[PDB]
Design a protein around this ligand. Structure first.
Ligand code: HEM
Ligand code: JZ3
Length: 402
């Protein structure tokens, strides 16, 4: 596309460090555009992301680096009967009435445990000491991974993140950095060594862990789903499900710190925490551009005639700064009117874990603000955000008077 020749000079490093300047141009120039270093069409606006995500002429496809990492059948990358089965497999523990039965007793004692380690220190780096551990410890216990330390769960999602988002391609469309999948393969090998004995056990002795239910639910007597059939969805969980509530919490906190009067409002009135989190997810979407769809028929989207079989990456984090919807979207504003957003995606492949995720983030922030009501950001340290596929702050140094 001639007038987008500037896109040939966009680099993977640029998109990882800060994709918003390129995507502001895309939303104005070409809401559906082929980005050479990603080797794919990308959807950048709210209208195009929502249309592709809900279109009957599209179905799910995994991004190239996502498929190299997760294989088949990753719940995000399949359709039809396999997708319906995998959705029926994951949905029981995520049902709102079910989450409401036990989410408080799950997350609140975990939040308190991690807080007790630093709440009298006067300083902390909340990404590593709080947001990530609460997120992974909550989900890890729900899954049946109680014995996998939070440090290890955090390491695995970081390696899987880098492998799944190792998207750069060269002039021939080949991956530019094939070595960057090695740590994804190493994480998977480690996960197998830990999880294979647990699956061996659960097949014979089912329990209330979610993965035990994935093996047994809905199956004929004495049968379980084959572990190779469920492992790619285990990996989907050990990346995003483990990573994103912590990133959403942390981005919400960075946003609140950027508006001190609003941080104060929320600490004084914790019933505003859900609204603060919803704006946090719009402001820096944790899953920023990690999923995609593929056309099943020739289709015209945003004036582009796509043949059948065309992948489109859904850059929901850009869509959530669409100035057709939002005033000054790069500013965090608690008091934005509560409008639809796309941080959980849309359509038949929209996030299955919204209700659980929102509660994890809510409870963690409630406990944080109760424990440390005079929490302040350490303005001697900068907050750097990183990531194009998954995005969040790489640290969050704070201070408080002791
Ligand atoms: C703040 C935290 C989270 C955010 C922002 C988030 C966001 C997303 C997004 C954008 C997608 C892709 C939707 C699309 O392609 O249209 C997705 C997929 C998915 N998410 Fe969430 N997620 C979060 C936490 C979780 C958690 C904790 C779980 C599990 C307990 C979960 C389970 C899933 C599943 C199973 C899918 C795949 C749905 C499918 O392809 O059918 N997510 N999520
Ligand atoms: C819930 O986890 C994910 C969602 C979308 C893409 C990758 C994931 O691991």
């Amino acid at each position: 596309r001639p007038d987008l020749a500037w896109l040939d000079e966009v680099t993977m490093t640029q998109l990882e460090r800060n994709p918003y300047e390129v995507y502001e141009r895309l939303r104005a120039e070409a809401p559906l555009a082929f980005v050479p270093v990603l080797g794919s069409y990308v959807a950048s606006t709210a209208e195009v992301c929502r249309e592709v995500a809900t279109s009957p002429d599209f179905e799910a496809v995994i991004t190239p680096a996502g498929g190299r990492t997760f294989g088949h059948p990753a719940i995000i990358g399949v359709n039809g009967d396999i997708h319906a089965d995998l959705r029926s497999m994951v949905e029981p523990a995520l049902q709102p009435a079910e989450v409401d039965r036990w989410i408080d007793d799950l997350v609140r004692p975990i939040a308190r445990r991690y807080l007790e380690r630093f709440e009298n220190d006067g300083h902390a780096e909340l990404v590593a000491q709080y947001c990530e551990p609460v997120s992974v410890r909550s989900l890890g216990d729900l899954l049946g991974l109680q014995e996998v330390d939070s440090d290890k769960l955090r390491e695995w999602f970081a390696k899987l993140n880098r492998s799944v988002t190792n998207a750069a391609v060269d002039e021939n469309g080949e991956f530019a950095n094939p070595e960057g999948f090695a740590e994804g393969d190493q994480a998977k090998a480690e996960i197998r060594a830990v999880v294979d004995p647990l699956i061996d056990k659960w097949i014979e002795h089912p329990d209330d862990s979610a993965i035990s239910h994935w093996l047994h639910d809905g199956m004929p007597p004495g049968q379980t789903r084959d572990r190779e059939y469920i492992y790619p969805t285990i990996y989907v969980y050990l990346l995003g499900a483990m990573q994103e509530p912590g990133h959403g919490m942390a981005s919400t906190l960075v946003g609140l710190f950027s508006r001190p009067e609003q941080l104060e409002e929320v600490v004084d009135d914790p019933t505003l925490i859900p609204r603060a989190i919803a704006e946090g997810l719009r402001w820096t979407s944790p899953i920023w551009s990690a999923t995609a769809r593929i056309s099943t028929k020739p289709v015209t989207i945003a004036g582009v005639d796509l043949p059948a079989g065309t992948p489109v990456m859904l850059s929901y984090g850009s869509a959530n700064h669409d100035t057709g919807k939002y005033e000054a979207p790069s500013q965090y504003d608690l008091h934005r009117p509560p409008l639809p957003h796309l941080a959980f995606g849309a359509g038949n492949h929209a996030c299955a874990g919204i209700y659980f995720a929102n509660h994890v983030m809510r409870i963690a922030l409630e406990e944080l603000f109760e424990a440390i009501p005079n929490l302040e950001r350490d303005t001697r340290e900068g907050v750097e955000f990183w990531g194009w596929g998954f995005r969040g702050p790489t640290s969050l140094h704070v201070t408080w008077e002791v």
